[PDB]
Every structure is written in C-alpha cells, then in structure tokens.
Amino acid sequence: SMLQRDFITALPARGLDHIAENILSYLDAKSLCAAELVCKEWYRVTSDGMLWKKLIERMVRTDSLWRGLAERRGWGQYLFPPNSFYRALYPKIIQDIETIESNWRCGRHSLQRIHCRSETSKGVYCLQYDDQKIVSGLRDNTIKIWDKNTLECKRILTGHTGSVLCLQYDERVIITGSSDSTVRVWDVNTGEMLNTLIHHCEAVLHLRFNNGMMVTCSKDRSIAVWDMASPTDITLRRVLVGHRAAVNVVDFDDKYIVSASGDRTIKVWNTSTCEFVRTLNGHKRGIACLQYRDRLVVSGSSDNTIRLWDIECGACLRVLEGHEELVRCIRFDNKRIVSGAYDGKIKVWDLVAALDPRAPAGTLCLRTLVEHSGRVFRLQFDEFQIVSSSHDDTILIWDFL
C-alpha cells in the first residue's frame, strides 16, 4: 500500500521493539555503525537494544576465535555495562584478531618448553590438550598429564608394557594404543585403568573415538571398529581388512571412516555399514599422518609432500611441497594446516589459498618453525597456539597471543 516505510521507527512505535532489534541484529559491524547514524530513533533502537553486545555475543557463539578471546582477554565476563562499552570494545577485538593473524604470518610467538625427563627411552609419541591439561603418551610406556598453566606433571599412568603410540580423551576417559598391541581405557579424572582391549596382533598405531564408537588400527594391517556402550562395555563390531601394510592412521565421522597405510593408500569406508567405499591413491610412498573433517582429507607422506583430497570424488585438490623430510603429523582448522616433519621442523600452510587452484605453490607455506631437535611426532593447535611433541623428549607450546 504505502510505497516506503521506516521499519526501524515504525516497529517500536507499535510496541514491537524486538522485531526492529532483530532486523538490526543481522547487520555486520559497519552496517550497524551506518544504522546508528541514520537518525535519532535508529540510534536509540541500537543503543536501547544493546545491539553491540548482541553482535559480540553472536560472534562468540559463531566463531571459536571470538570465543577463545572472550575467555582469554576477560571481556567474556561481561556477556550473557552500557551499550557504549561494547561499541568501544568491538574495534579492540578487531585489532586483537589482526595482531594474532600478523603473529601467525610472521612467526612471532612465545615459547614454553616442557622437558619430559624420561629416564630411559626418550620421546613423546602423542598428545592432546585443553585449557586445563596436556595429556601425553611416551616411549617409556607411560601417559603423563601436565598442567597447562604451571607445566608441572600431575599424574603418570602406568600399565602399558610398550610405548604409548596414540591417544585421545574426552570428558570421561583417556583411550590409548600401544606397541604392546593393546588398547587401554583410563579414567580421565583419576587415571584408573578401566578396560583393556586384547585384539590386535601388532602395535596399535592410531585410534579415534566419538559418540559411542571407536576405530583402532594396527601394524597388523587391520582396522577394528568398536561400539562403546560404556568404558567397561566395548564390543567389536567389524574388522576392516584390505590394506597391504601397517595402517598408520584412522579418522572418521558419521559419513566415512578414513584409513591410511604404509601401502601408499588412503581407504574410505562407510561408517554405518563398514563397507569399503573407495581408495584415494596418489602419494608415492607410505602415508604417516592424516586428518579428515567434512569433505577434506589432508595427508602427509614419506614422499615429503602433503596432499589435500575431496572425500566424495577422491580427487587430490593440491600437493603441498616444501618439507625436506617425512611428514609425520598433520592437523588443520578453518584457516591453516600445521605439519611436523622428521627434521624437527613445523610448517604453517594457508589452507584457503591451498584449496584455491589459482594460488601459486610458493605462497602456500606461511612459516617454518624450528625449535625441536628431533622428529616431530604429534601436534594439535587452535587459533592461538600450537602444542607439539617430539622424539627429543620435549613438549612445546607455541603461543601467538
């Protein structure tokens, strides 16, 4: 009927302020700034509506970087102080992000170094960390839990009779695989051994678990698929065989199980049915490490390269060259690939650039980080830091904030 209508003035006028606020909540920062300057009533709607507070909260809800900063910097205490406080805070967060991104691109970081002080057989094969702790598996047959803040050792878990090669934990349990060919389940709070799975014929090289199921893989060339009704009730569902050498890594989600092997192959399996789906071929030597999420698989190989793959069609999307030795661990998030090599070096790769076939190869490696004196066996990272462990018997925390 009417040609034009001031929605943001009209809606509060009828007692529907929240609709006007909801409209503005969809604006990006710069458009929210624009809305403030449209007219006095628009400003009042954004201000009385606490739109800047709502904008920061949506980011914390939608961006782990913003969530992580809220927690680290302490302004997260104010979420969930007038509107103007959040308006003035928003550019400080932007600048903070910018400095973090610059530190990554330029390699500016602080460094914490844990000496694991292994008495006999040195080296840390695997690790996982959170804000409270680092859990680590060692060639001396133990699991050591380190306090993330003080770097002291809080618990040594004993029971394996060979090296602790792989591990993962959640809010209840730690699960470990070992050169002694067993999988063990530990209480994450008390360290008590809760279960031991005797099944594999050779070293358990990798495992993952999630949402009541686990996959394990072994030097014995097989993959085992497990159903975990509880820490003490774990049943073998299926054995996947088909690899012609040790299976060095396994990852999975609800769509697929993904395994990679000394036999130079990646294999894809249907999680629900455990039926073979396809082999991703292409590496010229064995695959040492891998990570799979959504449609992307990234693998690192004895051929010194990293390959990116689409899981559905099996295509290799990009070959990453630059490491001078075997690529031994690899992880990735939304923006970066982080890889560790047998020469102790860690490389940071631009994942967006790598998935864009226009980008040249020489622009893909952002940095090379050289602080280990032995093979890098495992790393894990996030927006703010890398935690890595090595044959040199150290754990490093690389902090870019």
């Binding site: 792989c166 070293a203 090289l205 030097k219 040790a246 000394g262 064995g286 040492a288 004895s302």
Partner: peptide
C-alpha cells in the same frame, strides 16, 4: 625402526 608409531610396507 626407532619410530614405532609408523611402519613402511615391508
């Protein structure tokens, strides 16, 4: 062989 975590196709 010193790395027990991975193995070639041997």
């Amino acid at each position: 062989y010193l790395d027990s975590g991975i193995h070639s196709g041997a």
